[PDB]
Each structure stands twice: as structure tokens, then as C-alpha cells.
Amino acid sequence: AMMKAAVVRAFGAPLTIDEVPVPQPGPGQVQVKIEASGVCHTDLHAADGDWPVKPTLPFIPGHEGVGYVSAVGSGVSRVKEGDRVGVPWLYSACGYCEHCLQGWETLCEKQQNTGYSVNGGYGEYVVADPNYVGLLPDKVGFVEIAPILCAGVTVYKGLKVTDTRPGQWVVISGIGGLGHVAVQYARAMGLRVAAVDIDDAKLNLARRLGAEVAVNARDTDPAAWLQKEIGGAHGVLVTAVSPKAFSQAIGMVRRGGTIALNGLPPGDFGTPIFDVVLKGITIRGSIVGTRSDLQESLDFAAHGDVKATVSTAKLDDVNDVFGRLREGKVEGRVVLDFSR
Amino acid sequence: AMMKAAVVRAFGAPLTIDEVPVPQPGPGQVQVKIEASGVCHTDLHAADGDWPVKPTLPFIPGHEGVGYVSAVGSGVSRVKEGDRVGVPWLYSACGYCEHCLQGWETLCEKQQNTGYSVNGGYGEYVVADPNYVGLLPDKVGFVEIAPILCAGVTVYKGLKVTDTRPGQWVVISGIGGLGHVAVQYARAMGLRVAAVDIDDAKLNLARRLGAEVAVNARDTDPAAWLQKEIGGAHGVLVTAVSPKAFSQAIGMVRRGGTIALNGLPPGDFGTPIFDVVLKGITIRGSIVGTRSDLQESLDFAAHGDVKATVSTAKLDDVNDVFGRLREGKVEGRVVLDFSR
Amino acid sequence: AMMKAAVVRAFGAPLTIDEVPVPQPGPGQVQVKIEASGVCHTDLHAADGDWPVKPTLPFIPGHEGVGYVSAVGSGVSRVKEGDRVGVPWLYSACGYCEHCLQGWETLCEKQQNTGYSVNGGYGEYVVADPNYVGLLPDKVGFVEIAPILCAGVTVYKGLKVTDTRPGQWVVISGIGGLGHVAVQYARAMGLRVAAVDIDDAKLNLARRLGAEVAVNARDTDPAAWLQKEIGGAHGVLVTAVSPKAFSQAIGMVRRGGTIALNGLPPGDFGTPIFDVVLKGITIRGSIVGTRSDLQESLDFAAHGDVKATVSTAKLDDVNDVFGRLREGKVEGRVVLDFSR
Amino acid sequence: AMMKAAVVRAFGAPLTIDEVPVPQPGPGQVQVKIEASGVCHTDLHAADGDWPVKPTLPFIPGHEGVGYVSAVGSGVSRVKEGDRVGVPWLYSACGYCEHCLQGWETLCEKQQNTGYSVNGGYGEYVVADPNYVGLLPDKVGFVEIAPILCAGVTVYKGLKVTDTRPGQWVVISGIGGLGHVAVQYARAMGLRVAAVDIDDAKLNLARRLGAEVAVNARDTDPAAWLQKEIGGAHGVLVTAVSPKAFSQAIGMVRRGGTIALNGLPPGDFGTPIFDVVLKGITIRGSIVGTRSDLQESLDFAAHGDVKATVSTAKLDDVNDVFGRLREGKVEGRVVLDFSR
Ligand SMILES: NC(=O)c1ccc[n+]([C@@H]2O[C@H](COP(=O)([O-])OP(=O)(O)OC[C@H]3O[C@@H](n4cnc5c(N)ncnc54)[C@H](O)[C@@H]3O)[C@@H](O)[C@H]2O)c1
Ligand SMILES: [Zn+2]
Ligand SMILES: [Zn+2]
Numbered sequence A, B, C, D: 001a002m003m004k005a006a007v008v009r010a011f012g013a014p015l016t017i018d019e020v021p022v023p024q025p026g027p028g029q030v031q032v033k034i035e036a037s038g039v040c041h042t043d044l045h046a047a048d049g050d051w052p053v054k055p056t057l058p059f060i061p062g063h064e065g066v067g068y069v070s071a072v073g074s075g076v077s078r079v080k081e082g083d084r085v086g087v088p089w090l091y092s093a094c095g096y097c098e099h100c101l102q103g104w105e106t107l108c109e110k111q112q113n114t115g116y117s118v119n120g121g122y123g124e125y126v127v128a129d130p131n132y133v134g135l136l137p138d139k140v141g142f143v144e145i146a147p148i149l150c151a152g153v154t155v156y157k158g159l160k161v162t163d164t165r166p167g168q169w170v171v172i173s174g175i176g177g178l179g180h181v182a183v184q185y186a187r188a189m190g191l192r193v194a195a196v197d198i199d200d201a202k203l204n205l206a207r208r209l210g211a212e213v214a215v216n217a218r219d220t221d222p223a224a225w226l227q228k229e230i231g232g233a234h235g236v237l238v239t240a241v242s243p244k245a246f247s248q249a250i251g252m253v254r255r256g257g258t259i260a261l262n263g264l265p266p267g268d269f270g271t272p273i274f275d276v277v278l279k280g281i282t283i284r285g286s287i288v289g290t291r292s293d294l295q296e297s298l299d300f301a302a303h304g305d306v307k308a309t310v311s312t313a314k315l316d317d318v319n320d321v322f323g324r325l326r327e328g329k330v331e332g333r334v335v336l337d338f339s340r
């Protein structure tokens, strides 16, 4: 009847860990018993409120929750009890608007979002729409697979919309939680990879993870060096949370190239329109991924092409996690482990 | 042996109509006797030398010249004496670089530009590269067709890269020199047009041209209104590239839509990363087009689908033409008429 | 505490899945919570009790068990709780006999053997000597790394004692659990690899894994075929479970060549003394590997040079797994999955 | 022009002492005048033609001939007339092949064999390849040194390939023609020697030769005894290769030890897989030796460390000699004496 959960009740004060009621699945719904729950930067902004459209208090964050289906309402055919599933950012969509019909459910104006507009995976249980859960592969553990539910699918879809093809150069700007799996997806997609971050150790991660080129932003200029070495990149993926670098990205791309943006920092960034137009440059934002994007991105993990770098932590230490998460002292990703 | 031509001999200075020597075609070159020559703002930027890369002085402006091939250097096959051709902005490209080989010669870093880096059509004769001239439809007169070499191809190619298809919505932002031509291509491409401007007269023109909706930005927030009325436009063509136009385009575009920027404005514009990412928006630069683009835009002119509003003037009055343009007194396009 | 474990209570009889006491770590010992446990053919030899020296009944097999240290006995320094380790065939050795002092602990006459002389990893927990456990690489998953604890280390040491060097030919006879990773170690050690088995599917597997040439012993005489095809090999590693393959390998080497033997089917094989002497052939027994061998063989796995072909099964199905392995119906390794 | 030589004209028949031409050397050849010619069991198999590859008839046997260089052809630098040399089993190798370049000329596919494939030393003179003859020590008589060319180098190289070190144990199995010479090399090589045999005379001789231990296999299990008495031998040299000797060798050897086989018996021998694999035993064939092996073996004889038991006989009594060898009535080695 009760469960442990990290409930945000005040739009900025640390999360509390309380016994709350276990959500029961109604018709068309299922219940998921959480084994692991990934922590995303988005969770910070949910706890805080750096976003125009804000969560409703109180709520439970977590859109990288993974576990088994523990119960099922009527009318459900996609999943059964004991199925291995994840509940990602896109909690549900109407399924029949123009966006949904065209396989862009990610843009559905009637969408609900896990751990933001409805309760998420920072609890021992979570109710989900079985039509939009991620179907998880057996061969990959809960802790290792959690980050794919958001970080993975986000950078996978992001790389797809750079419109770069095998043999061409992709730049991964920022080798963090997202960035570091981005390197791995890019390689599996046959791309040549260049990495660029403020941290020279993060650049070593990229090097090990497959990148054949990396330069430090806080040293030389990324643009000038890349235009110099590789001849500019055909595509750029910006994962870097920092407002700036959404400008030096325009410079690392060669003419006719595409920059996909994963970051969600605040405020307007300076866009050199003259150069964008003359160099025929494309700038494109990419929102996580569709259900197909997600399944494809999980497949890459199953096959061993992709493997998240992950720090484990306990539900009760959630606030500790948020702390070091902000101070950029987190390597790769952090995943809450519910294992007893 | 000699000819008259408007010449820029110093930046910002009135052009002087000098007697100068007729240029002669060497091997792989042709000569063109100019019968009409389009004028546009690009010419003002050339004469003022206020773009990052200036022209070399002295020079003859004009990248919208049309006339008859009057001489043929050796090794030319594409055109012959008597052919009707235009000499567009793209004078030549290298033909072997990555861009040229992929049918993107407009991104060629070794390209020459007519009436800017090489002498243009503000004179009785001009030497051109037969491989890069525009082949003109028999049906259309020299004066009427001249602006298609610039305004025509620019907005046509711009509409193409908005990645819209028949039946979908496109917003044409700014119904002026470019815009009133864009409206017509848009219609011919099976698109539903929403016109946006602050000038009621320009808006009335859009309606006459087939615009299904016309919104005045002065009285109405077109972003709010279009989102309310049609859930946004699938494509936005910004023909008057300015901060207010850029921001509002981002507001008017439907989620997952594409914005094409048609101009070359100074400075950095503020881009709302957040909105661009959550909405999955594409921002894209487009000016003029390839030889294929041009031929396709010419064909629309030839079928009677597209007619530029045009007025004429004499070579001797080029400075006056510049004056009206600079003051913003020009309705449509001004074309220099060399006809007897 | 109790746990599930597969137990051998009578030779040739199906194993039973019993509830048994969790083994506790005494002084100098550690306890390992098993995540995955490879099924070696030695396990069948043991359960069937077809070796001259029987294992004590009853016993829990499994010497490819890997997981986390879950408890530490007093006085342990080498490893700590949470460490990822495996418990190989060589459970322990005396540490001070002639063999042990010369880094050949695999020959220690006082050695104990995991899942034979002491209980092994066909269970939820196993107690291990921390001085002899395998220290697993972070980079690799439990399921994938498990076969390296015997299959990998065995064929790696075996390849080492063939006394071949980069550029020379080695024959792998039997592409099963051991042989399929042997192909990869061989390639990683710069050898040209020839594959021999009695099943085209194993041969096809070997071809995918880097075998330059391959032959089905059932379809022609393998020794003669190899003599013509490659001029006889410089070395041969015998991982087959048929005494006949042993005799045949002796005819696969060129003069001066070395045959190394890993396979352990009961009985004798035929040594052609005359040809062995005349041709100066060396025949060599090779038994698993030392702690050094094991560390090195794990490093090849961490570097991505070697990757076991694996399929998982549940503890409950151990008998169906044994049956399939008996009838040659297994490709690569079967790894018992104890993961959540 | 003419000389006496014992000739085999029909396999298995008695030899006849015939008058045949004296072989004269051409370019790159020397002539040797025989002073003594050792006899061994290889000569019996040559005369009987009972090996897989047979001598061509007619032929003169003898691969233990020693004497003086009596003539030289052009282009000979290694020896000169008057030099004391022997013409061993390895008459010549190609010098170009893999084996020849790796110091294993004994394995040369193109080798010729003295008194087998080419005429040998059962005659007054023999033609030889100066690059392959043995260079005999000054201080040892012809009769005494003859056996070192065959028996000597065989047990010496054999001992070398047991890969034993001074201070370690070696078993000499069989103290006959070869064995009594082997005991001596072993002691000279600083090994502790254990003699094994069924004949009590041969064992008393081993003790006289420095064998620290001796066991009669008729009375006691030499394996069980040696394992208990010394912990098993580091190496075993089997000079009399019978299935029993071979089997017991596998039992007598210390784990990780090496068994070298000097004999050429027929048939396949049963080799216990379990024992060879688990005990990590090396089994190695070895007969004769390289030119280097020979020179080294001669040096030991030269230093008085090795002396073969030799009986002399005349050329005309060769058949009588063969009979003695067949009936196993020979103590030591028989050598034909051509001296005055
Ligand atoms: N002691 C050691 O040095 C070390 C460690 C213990 C295990 N052993 C032994 O290694 C052997 C193999 O182990 P495994 O797990 O890979 O068994 P496995 O069943 O997985 O593989 C056996 C392979 O041998 C092949 N086989 C049967 N007859 C063959 C033939 N005539 N020619 C070629 N291949 C033939 C099979 O086709 C099969 O592919 C076992 O006997 C095992 O006990 C090695
Ligand atoms: Zn997220
Ligand atoms: Zn929808």
C-alpha cells in the first residue's frame, strides 16, 4: 500500500523521502516495479524550475526508470506482467494528431511527460501507459540500461537528424552524460568522430570510446583547429549545457553542414546569421526520440555497440546526487539503484 | 571595341558611366550583349563594400544581366551565338571540390561572383562562363525574366529547403521585392500561403497573389494568431531577415517545422535554444541557388506561374535607381533596359 | 540463509536444483554473489564422472562463476566487498611447492578445483580463495566475461605453449566453448588460424571469428587437407572432445611443429611414435592457466580483441543445457544468468 | 680405382663384400678414407628395407664412418686433405628452406642420408659433403669416436630437448647401446640421473656410470617408486621405445616435465589424455642432431666426459655382426675396424 519515493513538494527545497501510496493501474494502464532509475539533468530543472512550462507540486521526478511490469489493467495487449520495461520522458501521446500520425509523437501537443507532468521513477513503483514504455532487452542489466531511456535515445536521434552519413565527420561537443554515449552511437553509425569539451579528461574518455580527434575548448579555438584538421565537420552534436559553445559550434561545421542541439540552457545565443546563410548551414533542435528511435537505441545497447558509463547511488542520497551533478563532478551518468 | 558601363571606382561613391573596352571571350568563354539588367540591394552592398569580403576596385556591378550570346571562345558547346542567356550571381565554381561534385556549387569556396568579384551586367557586354550562365525561356521578355536570376531562384530554392510539400502551410514573411515573388512560387508549388508584413499595401498584394491568409504584425501577434488558427506553419520563408522577423518566425513555425532565412543581415540574432529544441525546429540559410535551381525557377516563369513586378530605367540613371532603393521607394524590382 | 544450487548427487544422473545453505567465508576466504556462471564441458565430465579421479559427491559444479564479493572473511587484503571477481578452475594452490615457486601453480599437487573438489558457481553464492580469484575488468559484462574464466584462459595458455609466433599457422581443432575464443586469441596473438571441427556450423562460426581456412573432419581427412592447403601448421591446439581428433592433429603440423592439448575426453589416443620422432614433433598437455595467464587473458577481453559468443539460460534448465552440449547442439558458450 | 665395401643388393639378404669403384669427389665434395665405421640398428632396417621410405638398391650402409680426408674437390674450405672427419646420418641438407635457416637442418625435406639414400661407410672410401661431416677431436681414436656420430649426438640432443637444467632429475630409460652413452652426457650436463631398465647388468653399468639411482622395472613399478623416491623426474629420455617404456615414462615424469623419445618403433602407442593434459606433460621426438649438436657432442667425448663401450669387428664379418645385433647379444656398440 505504501512505498518509498523522492517527492518534490517545494519548487526548490531538497527532495523528501516519504512513504507514499502505491499508484494502482487503471484501465489501459500498467504498474512498473522499479529496479533502477537514471538521473538526468532535466530532473534538476524539474526540482528547481528553470523552465517556462513548470511541473505541478507535489510530484516525483524520474523519466529513466526501469523495472518489471508488476500489474496490469484491462485492455492491455502490448505488455504482460513480468515484462522488462522502462518509462521514458514521453509518458504518452494522443496517437492521432498530425505529429503522432507522422511518427513524430515527440511533438504531440497533448503529450504527458514522466517525472514532470505526471509522477516518475524516483519511487519504488510507477504507473505507466503501456503503449509508450520502452521494451528492454534481457541481456542488459537495469543499471546499465537506464541512461538509454533518455541520454541514449536523445543522442541517437540527435545524430540521425544531423543528416550525416557513414564516412563523414561528426563533432560531439561536450562529453558528459549524453556526450559520452553519443561518441559510441556515432561510431556504430559508421561516423568519424571528433570530440570537444572543457575537460581534458573527458576528452580522454572520448578517445577511449572511439573518437579519433579531440581538442580542448578552454585552450585553442575549436572552430579554427577543426576547420584546420578535418576540414570542418559535416555534422555537429551539441550536448554541452553551457549557453556559449552554441556559437563555436556554428564555426566547426563545414559549409552545408548540420548542427543538432541537445542542450536546454536558458536565454538567447548569438547566431551569426550572415555566415549561416552564406555557408548554407542548418541548425536543428532534437527532442529525445520517438518510440521507434528508443527501440533502435536500445538495440544498439543489446548488441554491445553502446555502453553507458554509470555511477550507482541510493534513492535516499538523491539530494547528494543533485549536488555533485550541478558542480559537474559527475563522470558519465548517475543511476539510482533500488536493488535490495 | 568600346562600350558604356556603370563603374564603381570607390566605395560609397556614385557610379560613373564610363566608356570602357568591350571584354573579349577567350577559350571556354562566351560574350553576352546585355539587353536587360536587374538591380537589387546586393548591388548596393557591392558598391558600398560593406560586406566582410569586399569587391576589388574598380568593377562593374550587376549579377542579373540577360541578353544574346554575341561571341563564342573556343571549346564551347552548351551555348552558341544568338542564344538568350543570363549571367547570374554565381559566375563560376571549381567543379571538382566536394561541394561542386555533390551539386552544391553555390557552396564552392573558390567560386567567382558576377558583378562583385568579376565584372557584371551593368554594361553593354560582359564575358561569362558558358557552363554557369542561365538558359532563358523563349516565352519571356528580357526585362520580365531578369529578376528571376536573383529574386526568383533565391525564394524558390528557399521554399524548397523549407522541406514542405503540396497542401502544407508556408508563411511568407515580408511581401516586398523577394516576398511578392515568393508568394507566387509558393502557390505554384501547391502550398497554402500565409502572408505576414507590417505594410497593409504589401499584404493586399499578397491576397491578390493567392495568399489564403494575411496577417499584419502591427495589429496582431502573428505567432500567437497562426498557432491559434492553423497550429503553425510547416515552413516559414523569411525574406526580410531581421531580429524581429527571426524571432517571430520561430513563433509562427509549427513544431518540427523548418525556417528558411533568405537574406544576409549584419550582426548576431538571439536564438531561443530552449524553444528550438523542445519544438524540434530547423533553421536554415538559403540565398540564390544552383544552376539546376535556376533552370527550375526559370521554368516557372516560362509557364506563366510567376511574374515579378518590374519597372525599367536607363544605365545613365543607375545612381537614381540606387537612391530609390536605398530610400526604400521601390515597389518590386527595377531593371535596367538596354533595348534599342 | 538458503540459496538455490544445481547439485550432482550421482554420476550420470540429472542434476537437481536444491535449496542449500549459503556458504560463509571463514578466515582468509571471501564470498561471491554470483551474477553469471559459464557452463564448461568439464562440468559434464565431472557430473558423468568419466575421469580417473572422481569429484566428491555430492558437489555443486561451476568454475566460470563471476559476480560481486558479497562478504569478506577476516584477514583478507587482496579484494574488498563490491569487487567484481570470478572463481576459476584453480581454486587454490599451496603457494610454496616447486611448481608454485616457478609460477606454475596450475601444476600444484595440493591444488583444489572449483566445482569439483570444492563447490562451485552453479549456485547463488560461492566461497573463494581471494588470492586465486580472477579480477574482472570494469569494461566487460558478467555474461560475456564468464567464459574467460576457463575457456579464455585455457586456450590462451594453450596457444602460448604451442611455441608459435606472429605470422605462423596455428590449427584450432574443435570450435566449441574453448575453440571459438581460441580463434580470437590466436588472431590477437598475430597467428594465421586454421579451423577444424565435425560440424559446418562451428566452422562457419570460426570463419566469422577470423579463421583464414577451415575444414570439416567428417568430409575429408583434415591432416592431409591441411598439409596441402597450408603446408602443415606450425602449431595445433586441440580443444575437441574426441580422442580421434587428438590422433589426427599429430598429422596436421609440419616437421618440428607443436601440438598442444586442452581437450579432456576419457581414454587414450594414438601417438605415431615413428613419425613423431622422425619429424621432431612436440606433443604438449596444457592445463587451464596461472593467475598471470588469467589476468592477461582477461585483458584481451577488456581490449575488445576477444568476445565470447554466448547464450544465457536459467539455473532451472541446467539439465537441458547439459543435454544440448552433449549432442553438439551448442554454439559458443552457455552462460547461466543469475542477474535480476 | 677399386675398393672393398659391404653391399646390400636385395632387402633382407646377407650383405656381400664386393669390389666396387672408389667414389671420387667432384666440385664441393671430399673423399674420406675410412678407418672405422660404427654399426647400429638403423643399418638393420636399411638392409631389410622395412621402413616406410626405403633405400634405393643396391647401396652401401654406414652412417658412422670416420677417417681421413683423402682427397678434395674444388671449392672446399671447411676441411683439407688429412683432416679427421666422420660422415654422419645427415649427409646433406638444402640450406635454403625454413628448417635449414632455423637451425633445424635435421628436418630438411630435401636431406640425404648416409648409408641409406646415398652410399655410406661400410667401405674403404666414401664421398661426402664437407659442409656436413663431423670434425673429429684429435685426442680420441677412430674406433672410440665412431658411435658418437649416431648414438652420441642422438642422446645428447635428446637430453637437450628434455629442457632440463643442471641440478634437476632426468630418467634414462633403457641403458643399452644408446642409454649407456646417455647416462654419461646427462652427468656431464650436471643432471641427477635415474636409470630404469629390466636387465640387471645394464643397471649395474648405469650405477658405474654415475647414476645416483637405479630401478628394475621387473621387480618394482618405476613410476610409483620414482614419484615417491624423488618426486618424479624433470625429464625422461626413452632410448628403448616400447609401449611399456612409453607408458611408464608418462608415469615417471614430474608434472610439467618432458619426455624425449629416441626410438623408432612401429605402430601407434596408447597415450592417456587425462594424464598428459592435467600433469602438463610434454612428449617430444628426437633422433640424431644438427651439425651444431654433433660438434658439441664430440667435444664432450673429446674432454673425456663420454666414452662408448665398443666392440670391434672386421668388414668381412658384417653379417655375423648383424646377427649379433638382431639376437640382442651386443654389449655397447660394434664398430668395423679398417685399421692395419
Ligand atoms: N584441463 C584444461 O586444460 C582445460 C580446462 C578444463 C576443460 N578442458 C576441456 O576442453 C574440452 C572442451 O571444452 P568445451 O567446453 O569447449 O567443450 P564443447 O562441447 O563446448 O566443444 C567441443 C567441440 O569439440 C568438437 N568435437 C567433437 N568431436 C570432434 C572432432 N572429431 N574434431 C573436432 N571437434 C570435435 C565439437 O564439435 C565441439 O565443437 C573439454 O573436454 C574440457 O573438459 C580444457
Ligand atoms: Zn532526460
Ligand atoms: Zn498527438
Ligand SMILES: [Zn+2]
Pocket (backbone or CB within 6 Å): B038, B039, B040, B041, B042, B043, B063, B064, B150, B151
Ligand atoms: Zn540581385
Ligand SMILES: [Zn+2]
Pocket (backbone or CB within 6 Å): B093, B094, B095, B096, B097, B098, B099, B100, B105, B108, B109, B110
Ligand atoms: Zn568547387
Ligand SMILES: [Zn+2]
Pocket (backbone or CB within 6 Å): C040, C041, C042, C063, C089, C150, C151
Ligand atoms: Zn573448464
Ligand SMILES: [Zn+2]
Pocket (backbone or CB within 6 Å): C093, C094, C095, C096, C097, C098, C099, C100, C105, C108, C109, C110
Ligand atoms: Zn603448490
Ligand SMILES: [Zn+2]
Pocket (backbone or CB within 6 Å): D039, D040, D041, D042, D043, D063, D064, D150, D151
Ligand atoms: Zn647409427
Ligand SMILES: [Zn+2]
Pocket (backbone or CB within 6 Å): D093, D094, D095, D096, D097, D098, D099, D100, D105, D108, D109, D110
Ligand atoms: Zn633445407
